[PDB]
Design a protein around this motif. Structure first.
Motif, short mmCIF file in Angstrom:
data_model
loop_
_atom_site.label_atom_id
_atom_site.label_comp_id
_atom_site.label_asym_id
_atom_site.label_seq_id
_atom_site.Cartn_x
_atom_site.Cartn_y
_atom_site.Cartn_z
N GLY A 3 2.14 -0.81 3.59
CA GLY A 3 2.96 -1.64 2.72
C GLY A 3 2.22 -2.87 2.27
N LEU A 4 2.97 -3.83 1.76
CA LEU A 4 2.40 -5.13 1.42
C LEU A 4 1.70 -5.78 2.61
N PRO A 7 4.42 -8.74 4.10
CA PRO A 7 5.73 -8.24 3.68
C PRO A 7 6.58 -9.40 3.20
N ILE A 8 7.31 -9.20 2.11
CA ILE A 8 7.98 -10.30 1.46
C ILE A 8 9.11 -10.87 2.32
N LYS C 143 11.57 -14.29 -5.38
CA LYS C 143 11.06 -12.96 -5.14
C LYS C 143 11.77 -12.33 -3.94
N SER C 145 12.09 -8.36 -3.13
CA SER C 145 11.18 -7.34 -2.64
C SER C 145 10.10 -7.14 -3.68
N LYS C 146 9.23 -6.16 -3.45
CA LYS C 146 8.07 -5.94 -4.30
C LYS C 146 8.46 -6.00 -5.77
N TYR C 147 9.47 -5.23 -6.16
CA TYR C 147 9.92 -5.25 -7.54
C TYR C 147 11.21 -5.99 -7.92
N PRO F 82 2.41 -9.61 -4.72
CA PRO F 82 3.41 -8.59 -4.43
C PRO F 82 2.97 -7.22 -4.93
N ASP F 83 2.42 -7.16 -6.14
CA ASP F 83 1.84 -5.91 -6.59
C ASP F 83 0.33 -6.05 -6.63
#
Ligand SMILES: [Mg+2]
Ligand SMILES: [Mg+2]
Ligand SMILES: [Mg+2]
Ligand SMILES: [Mg+2]
Lengths: 256, 226, 190, 251, 213, 107, 457, 180, 40
Positions: A3-4, A7-8, C143, C145-147, F82-83
RNA sequence: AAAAUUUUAGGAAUAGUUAAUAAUAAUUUAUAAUUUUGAUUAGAUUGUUUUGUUAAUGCUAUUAGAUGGGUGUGGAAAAAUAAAAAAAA
C-alpha cells in the motif's frame, strides 16, 4: 509494500500536546483512531443534555407512545433476545422484558406535592396538542447508545410520519416545560430524541454488570431492521414496576 | 538572536560578527556554542628536535638485547621530560608537584593575567587518569574578583599554557573540602588597598603609543623612509 | 524591434524607445516525421502514429480552455475552483464511499462555444445515507484516502423510489444489461 | 533557533531525534553535583523563616507496604546522628563527590560527614548529611532552625529520601526557593536593641579635595590572542556578561 | 496555572445555578472531520476546526487523556541512549488506577516497554492500585511517571543492555531479544538501520541540565 | 439532517449526528457484516494484549524494526505522495519497477 | 457598523477612563449600552446560545441570489450570544469611574447608586469561562528537558518548571474581577473608584506625585483635603451599606488602595499608614460579631506601608547651588529607621507574606535616605543573588556610595556595582549611568561604551 | 550544505537568504548596457526572475545630454545627466519594514538620490580613517549631552509614532450636545 | 573574507592549514579601531 | 491536499492492485478500482503571460528547468565539471 508508504489513516498531529515537545523532548504514542472513530461506528447518540440542577434529580414520569399488540417490533426484539442470550447469557439482567417495550417521547420530573395539579393540567394540554393528529406509522431500524453505552435502544427513523411526531412533541415540550414550569430534563426549546429502550444498566446493577455494555453483543444487530408500526396511543406514565406489570399510567390520549 | 552585536544592524554581513549569537545557531549542533578557545595546534606541537640524539625505548620493548646503559636511560628520561614541558606546562604536570595535588592553588593561563583580562581558577579536585598529562580537573573560576558559586570542570586543562604559585595558606588536605574563594563584592567587604578593580563593564584601556605610531606609519600619516 | 523590417535593423541589443522586447522563435522550421515502423507491424494495439504529433496542452489547436462559468459557479461562491460540485450518485460498493458523476465546462474560442464534460469523484459519506441516484452537493476537503478528497455536504434530492426499493430487500437500481463494448462476437445461445 | 511545531516527519513509535533523558546515578559524583546547591538554599530558608516538614522530632516510621508511596521526596532534619533502619551504609570519602559541598560547608554549617544509605531491597535511597557546629548564617528566633539544638550536641543531620536512577526533578528541591529576608542588619535599629543610640546618620556627602588614585598605566598584552571576543560572540570572560559589552577582555 | 482555576471555578459556579434552561444542541455544534489541509489534527474538545466566536458552557470531561511516561533505551550507532516515551490513553473520569495500568498496557505498540510489571507514580510517589483518579487529583496536566522492576538496577552494567561497541555479543545472545532483531552483522541494505548520533555530539561530557564547564 | 452547515463546514452526517437523528439506507448483508466485523476491533485487541502478551510483542518487534527498513524512512512530499505512480510517471519503466501502470484510480 | 458586545464596551470604557475623556464614554453609552440590564431572581442566569448557525435549505441554496448566500463571519450575528453571561455590572462600574474622572458628581452618584443597589439586592450572575481566543488553553508538556535552576554557575536562572528568582512585583492575589460575589464586587468597585481618584490627582499634579524630582513632593497639595474628604465619605458609605456581610470577604485590595491614597494625595508617614491600616482592620473585625482573630495586613498592604516610609525620607538630589541634598522639613532619620526596623520585624514574622523586589526596593531606598550606610549589606544579603532587579537599586545605592569617607571606596564600590550589573543581567539604566557620569572629574569612572561614544561625537 | 559545493558562486547561510537589493543587467557591448535595481533573494537561480521580490528600477550608466529641457545658459544644468528610476515606496517598505541587505553599487546610487548616506566603500583616499581614544571622546560627551527626556522624545518621534494629536483636534473630535 | 596576515600565529602542521587566525595584540587593537569607524 | 486544460487516420481491455477498518493484515473484511464520455501498455513530445503571418474568430511557434530508494545529513535533497550570485575585517 502492499500500500501507501505512509498510510493516510496514520497521519496524525496531536494539537492538545504542547508545541516543540514532539520534535525534541519526547515522542508521544497513542492509538489515535479509537477516539477518531465516529458517531456512526460507535453507535452513540446525542440526547438533549440536562442543566446540572436538573441533572441532580431523578426523573419521575415520562411521555410514551404505547406499542399495540401484535407488533413487528416486539416480535423481532424477542428474536433478538433469543439470539443474544444464546451468545452471551450475561446479558440477561441488562435486557428489558418485551412486556415493557414502549416508545419514549420525553422524560420529566414531577415533585410529589403539586402532583395532582400537574397531572390534570398536563393531561389536558396533551389532549389539546394531540387533538388534530391522526395515528402515526413509524419505522424502526438500527441501534444506538445513551449515557456512555449504558442504555441500548432502537432508533426511530425520520423516513415516515416521524415528521409529524417532531412537531407534536415540540408542542407539548413548549406547553409542559414552557407554559407551566415543569422540569423536562432538557430545554423546552429543544426537541427530544424518541427511542425504544432495549437493554439498560441501572446504578445498582452497574457493579456486577460493568460500566458499559460491550459492543460485541449488539454489533450485528446495530443496523438490523425491526419494521413499521402504527401508533394511536399516547401515555403519561409514572415509573412503578409492580402495580400492573406495565409502567403505571397516570394519563392517556387517543390519536384518531 | 538572544544577544546580537550592536543590535541587528545589517549594512554589511561582517557587521553582524563571526557568530550571530553566543547560543548554538542550529539546535541540532550544540557544540557550536561560543567558548573561549586556545591555539591547540601550536600548543601541542611538542619539539621533536629535543629528542634528537637520545635513543628512546618503547613501553613493550622489554627485551634484554633492546635496552641500554643506565646513563643512556637517564639522559633519555631527561630528554623526554624536556620534550613534555617543551611548550608550556599542562595543569596535571603542575599539580602532581604541589602538595595535596595542588588543591586550593590558583591556576592562571598566561593570557588571563595580561591586559585588562584578569582571571584564574581555584582547584577543587583532580582525577589523574593512568596517563599523567591528561585527566579531569575541577574548580572555581574567579574573574575580576568575582567567583563562581559551584565548581566546574576546568576547560582546556590538557593544553600546556598554565602557570601557578604555591602557597601553604591555600593548601587543603584530601580529608577536608576546598572552600570557594570569596567574591569581593559580596562575602568580603570591598576594600581598595586589598584589591583594586582592573576593568569594569563600561571601561576600556587607553591607546598604547607604539600601536598608534605603527598604525599611522601604516595608513601613511606618519612617514616611514627605507 | 519586432515592428521594424528586415533591412531596417541596426542594433540587436536594445529597444530604443519603448515597446515589447521580443525573441523571435522560428515558427516555420519544416519539421518532419521519421518513419521507423512498417505499416503492418506498429507496436501498439489501440492506436497508430504515422505523422507529426501536435503537442502541448492549451497550445493545442483548436484551443480548449477551462470555463469557470457554468451551473456550478452560478450557484456557488467557491473559495477555490472545484471546491463545490453538484452531481449524481453512481454506485455504492464501498463502505462510507459514494461515487459521484459531475459535469464541468470547456470553451472553444475558435467556434465560440461550450461543451460539457463529465468526471467521477469519490466522496466520503459517513453514516451511509446516499443511495444510488441521489442528487448531491459535494465539497473539497482533507485528504481522506488515496483517491477521496471530497465529502458529501448535503443531499439535495434523495432517491425515494430507490430507498423503498432497498427496504424491500431489492437492489437500489437494476444492474446494467450489457457491460463494456468488445471487438469480438460472443455467440451464447440459451 | 526556536523549537519546531510538531513532528510529522518520522514515525512516533521509533522516536528519532530526541534529547536524551537525563538520569541521576547515585554511585557517581554527579549525584551530589545536582543535589548540593539546593541543600544550601534549603538551609538558608530554614535560617530565615519556618517551613513545616523540614523539622521532625524523630525518625519517620512507615510500614513496608506504604514505604514507596510515602517516603520518596521526603526531606527532614534531625538533631542527632541515627541512621535509618534497614539501610546499608556507604561512606562518601571519594574527594570529587565531597567537592560540591564546598560552598555549603564554608558559608553555611561545616559539613562533618556525608552518607549514602541504600535500602536492602535496593530500590530506595537516603542522602544523609551531618553538619557540625553552629550556622555561619545568623539564625532568626521565629525561624524553623531555632527549634533545633544542633544549631544556635553541636552536630545535626539532614535526611533526603529518593529513588535511584531518576531525573533530577523528582528529587523535590525546587519547592524551597521561597526567599525570606535576613533581618540581622536591621536588628540594630529595632526598639529592642540598645546599640541604636550609637548610630549616627550621614545625610550629606562630605567635601572632597582629592580625586581617586589613578589606575596603574596599561600594559598591552604580549602574547597571541584569539581575535575580537566581540566578533566571536564570547561573553566578556567566557564567564558572564553580555557580548555587546567587551569590558575586561584584554584590550 | 491561572487557566485551570479560572475554568474550574467557572464550572463550579455554573453547576450551582438554580435557573438554567439547558443548552440547545442545534446551537451547540460538534466538530468536523472535514477541513482543508492534508493532516488530521486532533484538538481540545472545547475547540473546533472552524471559527467559533462564542464561549460554550463548561462541561465536565468524561474522558481524561492521561499521559504516562516510560524510559526506553534507544539504540544509536555510538551506543545506547536513555530517553523518554509517552503513552497516551483516554481514561474514563472515575476509573481506578489498576484499570489505568490495564489501558496503558493495551495502548503501547513498542515491544520494548511493558515486558515486566510497572508501577505508576507521581513525582516519585507510588499510587494505590486501589483508588480513583479523583482522590489523587489527576488531570491531563498532571505529570505521571511509570517505574519498571529492574529500573533501580539500571545503574549497574547488567540490566542495562550491552552495546556491541564495547561488549561481546555471543551466539548465546545473537538469537535472543533486541540484539537478535537488530542484526549486528552488516547487510547490503544495512539491516534495520538505526538512528545514529556521533560520539563528540555533546562534547566530552554527555547531556545535562546543568552547564558543567 | 439532509443539509450541511455553511458556516461550520460540517457535513450533513455531522448535523444529523448533532440532532441525534439517523438517516441510513437499509443495508445488505455485505455492509452489515463488514461493519459488524469492524466495530469489534478494539475488544478483540484488548483481549489479545491482556491474555497473550508474547505473541503481541513478536508482531510488534516486526513492525518496529520494519519502520527502519523499507523504502522511505521519513515523510516528505516524495514519500507522502498519495499517488506515487501517478505523480511520478517518468520513473515507471526504468527506475521504479513496482508499478506497471500510472493510473489505478479516478485521479 | 459592528455592534460592540459587552466585553468590547468594557475595553473602550477602560480607554475612556485612562484618557479621562467623559465625552467619549457618554456617546458610547448613549449609543450601545442603554438597555443593558442586571440579573434578577426572575432572570434565567447564563443564557443558552440561541443562534441556529447559518445553513441553507436546498431551495434557499438554489433559488437565492449570490449575495444572500454569502456568509462571511460577521460579528453582529452572535452579539446576543457574546452577551449571554451578563457582564453589565462592569459597564456600570466603568461608567461611574468615567463620570468621576471627568469631574461630574451627579451622574457619578447616579451610576454608583444603581450599581450599589443592584449588588445588594440582586443575585450574582454566573461568570463566563475563560475565552479560548483571548487566553489560550494550556497544552500538555513534560518539563524534563529544561535548563536547571543552577544551569549557569554564575547566577540563578529562572526556569519553565519553577521560579527561583522570586516575584519582581507584588501581585494582589485575587481572581479575575468577574468571579466575585456581588458584595465582593461592591467592595472592588469602591477600591476602583478610589484608584481613579488617585489617577486623576496624578494627572492634575504630575510634579508633586513623582518621587524626589522637586521639593514640591514633600507637601500636601491644596485640593488634597476635599479629595480625602470624598474618600472618607465613600468608605464610610461602604461600611454603612454592607453590614456584617463584610466579615466574610476579601478587603485586602481595598485596604492597599486606601493606603496608597492616604500615602500619595494626603501624605502620611509610614507609621501613620500602619496605624490607619490597623484601625481599619479592627473596624472590620468588630463589625462582624465574633472572637476577633484579625487577618494580618497582606503583602501588598505592607508594600504601601514601606513605600510610605520611602516617601517619608526622600531627597532632592543635586541642587544647582552644588548643595548636596534637600530633605523633607522636619525629618528625623532615627525615628524613621526605628519604625522601619520594627515594621520589617513584623513582616518577616508573619509566614504568609511573600517578599518581592519592590518591597526590598522601598526598604533600601529608606535606608539610603536615612544615611544608614547599611544599605549595601541589606542589599547584598537579602536581594542581590536571590532576585531580579531594576537598576533603581543601584541608583539609590549610588547615592549611598557617594557619601562614604575616602574617594577610593566610592570608586571601587561603584565599579563593583557595575560588575554586578554585568553578572546578574541588570541592564544598568540610562538614569543610573548619567548619575555616575556627573562625577567623572572626581571618580574617573567611564560609563558609556567605546562604540556609543564614537557614534555620539 | 551541498555535498560538492558549487564553487564559483558561494554565499552565506541557506538559500533563499534574506532579500538583498542588487544591480544586475545582461552583459553586452558597453554602448548599450543598462542595469536593474531589484529586490531579490540571496541565492539566485539560472534566471533571475525565479527569486525576485520586487522590481525597483532601471539605471543607465551613460552620461546624457539633456535634450528634454531647453538649452540653458545656466552652468550647472549643462553638465551631462545620469538617469535613474527609483521605486521608493517599495524601497522604503523592503529596506525599512522587511530589513533588506544592500550591495555597494546600488548603495552609491541611492546615496546620490538622498535616500541613504554615502556608502562604506566610497573613499576619498585623501583623508585617512580616523583614530579614537576613549578619554577624549568622554570629555567631548560630558561637554555636550542633551537632556534625558528631550532625547527620549526625539527617539519617540523618529522611531515610534510621528503624527500626534494637539489638544485642538481632541476638542474638535469629542462629541457635542445631544450625545454630550 | 577574514584577512589572515603573515604575522598571525603560524601553525606548524603538515596535516592542515598553514596559518591559524590568532592576533598580535597590535592587530587586535587595529581591528578594533577600524570596526569602531564602521560602527559609526 | 485538490479542480480545470492533455497528442497519435483507421481503437481493447488494464493491475502489488479500490474502499473500509488501523499508527493490523507476505491468507483483515467486501457484490472492489481503472476503461469505448477512448483506458493501460506503445510512438512522438520539456505542460496553462513569450513567435510569425493577418483587416480578422484563426492558422503557426515558445526554450528551459524537479528522473526512486539503499546510517536518511539538513530549515528544505536541489548534493559530484561546465559561475559571472561577492561568500561572516
Ligand atoms: Mg532566526
Ligand atoms: Mg492522486
Ligand atoms: Mg516508459
Ligand atoms: Mg543512489
Amino acid at each position: 509494500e502492499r500500500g501507501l508508504y505512509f498510510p493516510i489513516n496514520h497521519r496524525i498531529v496531536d494539537h492538545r500536546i504542547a508545541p516543540g515537545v514532539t520534535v525534541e523532548e519526547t515522542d508521544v504514542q497513542s492509538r489515535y483512531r479509537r477516539e477518531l472513530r465516529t458517531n456512526f461506528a460507535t453507535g452513540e447518540t446525542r440526547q438533549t443534555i440536562a442543566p446540572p440542577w436538573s441533572a441532580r434529580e431523578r426523573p419521575t414520569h415520562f411521555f410514551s407512545l404505547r406499542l399495540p399488540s401484535r407488533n413487528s417490533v416486539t416480535l423481532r426484539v424477542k428474536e433478538m433476545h433469543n439470539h443474544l442470550l444464546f451468545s452471551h447469557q450475561q446479558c440477561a439482567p441488562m435486557l428489558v422484558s418485551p412486556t415493557k417495550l414502549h416508545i419514549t417521547l420525553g422524560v420529566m420530573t414531577i415533585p410529589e406535592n403539586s402532583r395532582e395539579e400537574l397531572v390534570k393540567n398536563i393531561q389536558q394540554s396533551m389532549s389539546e396538542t394531540f387533538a388534530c393528529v391522526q395515528p402515526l406509522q413509524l419505522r424502526f431500524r438500527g441501534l444506538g447508545t445513551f449515557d456512555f453505552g449504558r442504555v441500548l435502544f432502537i432508533r426511530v427513523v425520520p423516513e415516515a410520519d416521524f415528521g409529524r411526531l417532531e412537531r407534536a412533541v415540540c408542542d407539548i415540550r413548549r406547553r409542559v416545560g414552557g407554559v407551566l414550569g415543569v422540569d423536562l430534563k432538557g430545554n423546552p426549546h429543544d426537541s427530544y430524541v424518541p427511542h425504544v429502550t432495549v437493554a439498560k444498566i441501572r446504578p445498582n446493577q452497574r457493579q456486577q454488570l460493568g460500566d458499559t455494555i460491550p459492543q460485541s453483543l449488539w454489533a450485528d444487530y446495530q443496523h438490523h431492521d425491526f419494521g413499521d408500526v402504527t401508533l394511536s396511543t399516547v401515555d403519561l406514565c409514572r415509573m412503578k414496576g409492580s402495580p400492573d406489570g406495565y409502567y403505571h399510567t397516570e394519563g392517556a390520549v387517543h390519536l384518531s | 538572536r538572544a544577544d546580537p552585536l550592536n543590535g541587528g544592524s545589517s549594512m554589511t554581513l561582517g557587521s553582524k560578527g563571526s557568530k550571530l549569537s553566543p547560543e548554538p545557531h542550529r539546535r541540532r549542533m550544540p557544540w557550536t556554542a561560543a567558548k573561549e578557545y586556545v591555539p591547540g595546534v601550536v600548543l601541542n606541537a611538542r619539539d621533536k628536535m629535543v629528542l634528537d640524539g637520545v635513543q628512546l625505548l618503547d613501553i613493550e620493548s622489554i627485551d634484554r638485547a633492546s635496552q641500554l646503559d643506565p646513563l643512556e636511560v637517564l639522559r633519555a628520561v631527561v630528554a623526554t621530560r624536556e620534550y613534555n614541558i617543551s611548550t608550556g606546562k599542562n595543569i596535571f604536570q603542575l599539580a602532581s608537584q604541589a602538595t595535596y595535588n595542588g588543591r586550593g592553588q590558583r591556576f592562571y593561563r598566561k593570557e588571563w593575567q595580561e591586559g585588562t583580562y584578569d582571571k584564574y581558577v581555584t582547584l577543587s579536585a583532580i582525577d589523574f587518569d593512568r596517563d599523567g598529562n591528561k585527566g579531569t580537573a575541577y574548580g572555581y573560576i574567579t574573574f575580576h574578583g568575582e567567583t563562581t558559586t559551584r565548581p566546574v570542570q576546568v576547560d582546556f586543562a590538557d593544553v600546556p599554557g598554565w602557570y601557578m604559585d604555591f602557597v601553604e595558606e591555600r593548601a587543603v588536605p584530601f580529608t577536608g573540602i576546598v572552600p570557594p574563594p570569596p567574591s569581593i563584592g559580596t562575602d568580603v567587604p570591598v576594600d581598595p588597598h586589598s584589591y583594586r578593580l582592573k576593568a569594569y563593564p563600561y571601561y576600556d584601556a587607553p591607546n598604547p603609543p607604539e600601536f598608534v605610531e605603527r598604525l599611522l606609519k601604516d595608513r601613511g600619516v606618519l612617514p616611514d623612509t627605507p | 524591434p519586432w515592428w521594424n523590417f528586415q533591412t531596417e535593423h541596426r542594433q540587436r541589443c536594445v529597444l530604443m524607445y519603448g515597446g515589447a522586447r521580443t525573441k523571435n522563435t522560428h515558427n516555420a522550421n519544416h519539421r518532419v516525421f521519421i518513419k521507423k515502423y512498417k505499416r503492418n507491424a506498429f507496436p501498439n494495439r489501440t492506436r497508430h502514429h504515422w505523422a507529426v504529433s501536435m503537442t502541448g496542452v492549451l497550445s493545442q489547436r483548436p484551443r480548449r480552455m477551462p470555463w469557470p462559468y457554468d451551473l456550478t459557479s452560478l450557484i456557488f461562491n467557491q473559495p477555490r475552483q472545484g471546491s463545490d460540485k453538484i452531481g449524481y450518485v453512481v454506485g455504492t460498493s464501498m463502505l462510507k464511499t459514494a461515487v459521484v458523476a459531475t459535469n464541468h465546462m470547456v470553451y472553444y474560442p475558435k467556434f465560440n462555444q461550450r461543451v460539457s464534460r463529465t468526471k467521477r469523484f469519490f466522496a466520503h459519506d459517513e453514516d451511509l445515507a446516499c443511495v444510488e441516484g441521489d442528487l448531491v452537493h459535494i465539497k473539497q476537503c482533507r485528504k481522506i484516502s488515496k483517491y477521496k478528497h471530497y465529502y458529501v455536504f448535503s443531499i439535495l434530492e434523495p432517491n425515494v423510489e430507490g430507498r423503498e426499493r432497498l427496504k424491500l430487500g431489492l437492489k437500489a437500481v437494476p444492474p446494467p444489461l450489457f457491460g463494456y463494448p468488445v471487438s469480438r462476437r460472443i455467440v451464447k445461445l440459451n | 533557533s526556536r523549537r519546531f511545531r510538531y513532528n510529522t516527519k518520522f514515525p512516533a513509535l521509533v522516536s528519532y531525534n530526541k534529547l536524551p533523558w537525563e538520569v541521576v546515578n547515585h554511585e557517581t559524583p554527579q549525584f551530589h553535583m545536582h543535589v548540593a546547591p539546593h541543600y544550601e538554599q534549603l538551609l538558608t530558608l530554614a535560617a530565615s523563616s519556618p517551613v513545616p516538614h523540614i523539622i521532625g522530632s524523630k525518625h519517620i516510621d512507615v510500614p513496608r507496604e506504604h514505604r514507596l508511596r510515602l517516603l520518596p521526596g521526603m526531606l527532614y532534619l534531625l538533631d542527632g546522628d541515627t541512621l535509618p533502619g534497614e539501610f546499608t551504609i556507604n561512606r562518601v570519602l571519594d574527594p570529587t563527590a565531597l567537592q560540591y559541598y564546598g560552598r555549603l560547608s564554608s558559608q553555611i554549617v561545616t559539613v562533618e560527614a556525608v552518607r549514602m544509605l541504600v535500602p536492602d531491597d535496593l530500590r530506595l535511597l537516603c542522602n544523609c548529611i551531618t553538619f557540625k557546629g553552629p550556622l555561619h548564617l545568623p539564625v532568626a528566633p521565629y525561624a524553623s532552625l531555632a527549634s533545633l539544638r544542633g544549631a544556635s550536641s553541636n552536630c545535626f543531620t539532614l535526611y533526603h529520601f529518593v529513588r535511584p536512577n531518576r531525573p533530577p526533578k523528582e528529587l523535590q528541591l525546587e519547592k524551597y526557593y521561597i526567599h525570606a529576608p535576613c533581618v540581622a542588619p536591621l536588628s540594630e535599629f529595632a526598639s529592642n536593641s540598645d546599640e541604636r543610640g550609637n548610630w549616627r546618620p550621614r545625610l550629606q556627602a562630605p567635601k572632597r579635595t582629592r580625586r581617586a588614585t589613578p589606575l596603574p598605566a596599561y600594559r598591552p598584552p604580549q602574547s597571541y590572542l584569539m581575535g575580537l571576543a566581540e566578533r566571536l560572540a564570547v561573553v566578556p570572560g567566557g564567564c558572564f556578561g553580555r557580548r555587546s559589552l567587551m569590558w575586561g577582555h584584554w584590550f | 496555572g491561572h487557566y485551570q482555576q479560572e475554568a474550574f471555578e467557572a464550572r463550579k459556579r455554573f453547576e450551582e445555578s438554580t435557573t438554567y434552561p439547558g443548552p440547545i444542541r442545534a446551537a451547540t455544534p460538534g466538530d468536523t472531520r472535514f477541513y482543508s489541509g492534508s493532516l488530521e489534527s486532533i484538538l481540545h474538545d472545547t475547540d473546533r476546526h472552524y471559527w467559533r466566536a462564542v464561549t460554550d458552557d463548561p462541561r465536565v470531561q468524561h474522558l481524561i487523556p492521561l499521559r504516562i511516561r516510560f524510559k526506553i533505551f534507544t539504540w544509536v550507532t555510538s551506543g545506547w541512549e536513555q530517553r523518554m516515551q509517552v503513552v497516551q490513553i483516554m481514561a474514563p473520569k472515575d476509573s481506578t488506577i489498576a484499570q489505568v495500568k490495564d489501558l496503558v498496557i493495551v495502548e503501547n505498540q513498542s515491544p520494548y516497554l511493558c515486558v515486566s510489571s510497572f508501577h505508576l507514580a507521581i513525582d516519585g510517589k507510588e499510587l494505590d492500585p486501589q483508588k480513583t483518579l479523583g482522590e489523587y487529583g489527576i488531570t491531563e496536566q498532571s505529570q505521571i511517571d511509570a517505574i519498571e522492576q529492574n529500573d533501580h538496577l539500571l545503574h549497574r552494567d547488567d540490566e542495562r543492555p550491552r552495546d556491541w561497541t564495547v561488549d561481546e555479543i555471543t551466539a548465546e545472545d545473537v538469537k535472543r531479544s533486541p540484539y537478535k532483531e537488530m542484526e549486528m552483522q552488516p547487510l547490503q541494505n544495512l539491516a534495520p538501520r538505526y538512528e545514529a548520533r556521533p560520539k563528540g555530539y555533546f562534547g566530552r561530557t554527555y547531556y545535562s541540565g546543568m552547564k558543567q564547564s | 439532517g439532509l443539509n450541511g452547515c455553511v458556516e461550520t463546514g460540517r457535513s450533513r452526517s455531522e448535523v444529523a449526528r448533532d440532532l441525534g437523528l439517523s438517516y441510513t439506507r437499509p443495508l445488505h448483508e455485505n455492509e452489515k457484516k463488514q461493519l459488524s466485523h469492524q466495530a469489534v476491533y478494539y475488544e478483540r485487541l484488548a483481549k489479545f494484549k491482556m491474555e497473550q502478551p508474547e505473541a503481541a510483542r513478536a508482531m510488534e518487534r516486526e513492525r518496529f524494526v520494519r519502520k527502519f527498513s523499507g523504502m522511505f524512512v521519513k515523510m516528505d512530499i516524495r514519500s507522502g505522495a498519495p499517488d506515487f505512480p501517478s505523480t511520478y510517471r517518468r520513473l515507471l519503466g526504468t527506475k521504479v519497477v513496482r508499478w506497471a501502470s500510472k493510473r489505478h484510480g479516478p485521479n | 457598523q459592528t455592534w460592540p458586545c459587552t466585553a468590547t464596551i468594557c475595553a473602550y470604557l477602560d480607554v475612556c477612563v485612562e484618557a479621562g475623556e467623559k465625552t467619549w464614554a457618554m456617546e458610547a453609552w448613549n449609543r450601545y449600552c442603554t438597555e443593558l440590564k442586571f440579573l434578577e431572581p426572575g432572570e434565567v442566569d447564563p443564557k443558552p446560545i440561541s443562534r441556529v448557525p447559518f445553513s441553507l435549505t436546498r431551495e434557499e441554496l438554489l433559488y437565492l441570489p449570490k449575495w444572500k448566500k454569502h456568509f462571511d463571519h460577521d460579528p453582529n450575528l452572535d452579539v446576543m450570544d457574546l452577551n449571554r453571561f451578563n457582564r453589565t455590572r462592569e459597564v456600570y462600574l466603568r461608567m461611574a469611574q468615567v463620570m468621576l474622572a471627568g469631574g461630574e458628581r451627579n451622574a457619578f452618584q447616579h451610576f454608583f447608586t444603581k450599581l450599589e443597589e443592584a449588588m445588594l439586592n440582586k443575585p450574582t450572575p454566573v461568570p463566563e469561562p475563560p475565552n479560548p481566543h483571548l487566553v489560550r488553553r494550556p497544552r500538555w508538556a513534560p518539563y524534563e528537558h529544561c535548563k536547571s535552576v543552577h544551569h549557569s554557575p554564575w547566577r540563578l536562572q529562572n526556569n519553565g518548571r519553577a521560579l527561583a528568582l522570586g516575584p519582581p512585583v507584588t501581585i494582589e492575589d485575587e481572581m479575575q474581577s468577574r468571579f466575585f460575589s456581588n458584595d465582593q464586587f461592591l467592595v472592588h468597585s469602591v477600591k476602583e473608584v478610589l484608584r481613579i481618584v488617585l489617577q486623576e490627582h496624578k494627572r492634575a499634579h504630575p510634579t508633586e506625585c513623582t518621587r524626589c524630582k522637586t521639593e514640591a513632593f514633600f507637601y500636601k497639595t491644596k485640593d488634597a483635603d476635599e479629595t480625602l474628604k470624598f474618600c472618607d465619605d465613600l468608605i464610610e458609605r461602604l461600611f454603612a451599606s454592607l453590614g456584617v456581610r463584610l466579615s466574610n470577604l476579601n478587603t485586602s485590595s481595598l485596604l492597599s488602595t486606601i493606603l496608597e491614597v492616604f500615602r500619595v494625595v494626603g501624605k502620611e508617614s509610614g507609621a501613620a499608614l500602619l496605624q490607619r491600616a490597623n484601625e481599619f482592620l479592627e473596624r472590620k473585625a468588630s463589625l462582624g460579631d465574633a472572637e476577633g482573630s484579625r487577618e494580618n495586613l497582606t503583602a501588598s498592604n505592607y508594600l504601601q506601608v514601606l513605600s510610605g516610609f520611602a516617601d517619608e525620607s526622600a531627597f532632592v538630589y543635586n541642587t544647582k547651588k552644588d548643595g548636596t541634598c534637600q530633605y523633607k522639613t522636619g525629618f528625623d532619620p532615627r525615628t524613621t529607621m526605628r519604625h522601619l526596623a520594627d515594621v520589617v520585624q513584623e513582616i518577616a514574622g508573619n509566614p504568609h507574606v511573600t517578599w518581592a523586589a519592590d518591597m526590598h526596593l522601598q526598604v533600601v531606598e529608606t535606608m539610603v535616605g536615612c544615611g544608614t550606610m547599611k544599605a549595601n549589606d541589606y542589599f547584598v544579603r537579602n536581594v542581590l543573588r536571590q532576585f531580579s532587579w531594576d537598576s533603581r537599586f543601584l541608583e539609590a545605592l549610588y547615592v549611598e556610595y557617594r557619601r562614604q569617607d575616602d574617594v577610593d571606596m566610592w570608586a571601587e564600590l561603584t565599579k563593583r556595582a557595575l560588575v554586578w550589573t554585568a553578572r546578574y543581567n541588570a541592564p544598568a539604566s540610562e538614569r543610573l549611568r548619567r548619575l555616575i557620569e556627573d562625577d567623572y572629574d572626581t571618580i574617573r569612572v567611564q560609563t558609556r561604551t567605546f562604540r556609543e561614544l564614537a557614534v555620539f561625537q | 550544505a551541498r555535498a560538492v559545493i558549487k564553487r564559483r558562486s558561494p554565499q552565506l547561510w541557506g538559500a533563499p537568504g534574506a532579500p538583498i537589493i542588487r544591480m544586475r543587467g545582461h552583459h553586452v557591448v558597453w554602448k548599450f548596457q543598462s542595469y536593474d535595481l531589484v529586490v531579490e533573494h540571496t541565492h539566485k537561480r539560472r534566471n533571475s526572475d525565479i527569486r525576485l521580490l520586487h522590481y525597483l528600477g532601471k539605471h543607465c550608466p551613460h552620461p546624457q545630454k539633456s535634450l528634454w529641457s531647453p538649452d540653458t545658459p545656466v552652468a550647472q544644468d549643462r553638465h551631462l545627466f545620469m538617469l535613474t528610476t527609483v521605486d521608493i515606496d517599495a524601497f522604503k517598505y523592503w529596506f525599512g519594514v522587511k530589513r533588506c541587505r544592500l550591495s555597494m553599487k546600488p548603495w552609491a546610487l541611492l546615496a546620490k538620490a538622498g535616500l541613504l548616506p554615502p556608502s562604506l566603500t566610497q573613499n576619498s583616499k585623501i583623508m585617512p580613517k580616523p583614530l579614537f581614544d576613549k578619554e577624549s571622546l568622554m570629555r567631548y560627551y560630558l561637554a555636550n549631552r542633551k537632556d534625558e527626556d528631550v532625547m527620549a522624545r526625539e527617539k519617540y518621534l523618529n522611531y515610534e509614532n510621528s503624527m500626534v494629536k494637539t489638544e485642538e483636534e481632541r476638542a474638535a473630535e469629542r462629541p457635542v450636545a445631544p450625545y454630550l | 573574507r577574514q584577512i589572515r596576515p603573515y604575522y598571525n600565529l603560524p601553525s606548524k602542521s603538515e596535516h592542515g592549514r598553514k596559518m591559524t587566525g590568532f592576533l598580535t595584540p597590535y592587530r587586535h587593537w587595529m581591528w578594533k579601531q577600524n570596526e569602531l569607524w564602521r560602527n559609526v
